[PDB]
Amino acid sequence: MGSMERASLIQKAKLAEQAERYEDMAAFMKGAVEKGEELSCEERNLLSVAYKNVVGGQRAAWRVLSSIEQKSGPEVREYREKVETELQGVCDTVLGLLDSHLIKEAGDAESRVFYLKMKGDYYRYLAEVATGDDKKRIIDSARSAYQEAMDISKKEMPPTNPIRLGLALNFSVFHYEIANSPEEAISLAKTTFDEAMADLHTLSEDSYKDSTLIMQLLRDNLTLWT
């Protein structure tokens, strides 16, 4: 996308989202990132939504195929491997954008925590399909990114901040689903929920809606886990 203007890439990413063309959206946002300028709050959301939808489809397909494979020629394994490789390529692409050079230029809490949560998420997706000599290293890479994001968010953001809440939600899912630490997952979700509840009185009607929506997701997980 080197020949397209940054503003045109952003405008087309928004159009692609409206058209539910998430692969296009992701390619446009990849082009925007590669222009080398920092991303605004809105632009970070476009980048994240695009790739989350792309990899979300790949994860769903991989789970269908992995399930068929476990029930069971080489075809099912071969095709699961093809989907798995494509998923890993997307995760590697996102991680490459974060590393070159989104994270190192992100100084504000809102951008730095957001990018590090992203980094934890895409290593988590890599961990979901990992089975070799590096599942452990991938899990530790996810944990380290989430942990750095938590530390910053606890120091710099109020307990109701939606980025702080969604980071804690996903880190708790990491604990439960990847790290085999359900007690840590439950403790984190419950402490996050309780500290947000105690801060809701400070919020406007619209911020209250933003925060309580994510608190409900924490509660939903706790209901499933307990």
Binding site: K52, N53, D121, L169, N170, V173, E177, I214, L217, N221
Partner: peptide, 7 residues
């Protein structure tokens, strides 16, 4: 277990 949605 649900993770965070984008929108």
């Amino acid at each position: 277990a649900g993770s965070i949605p984008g929108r």
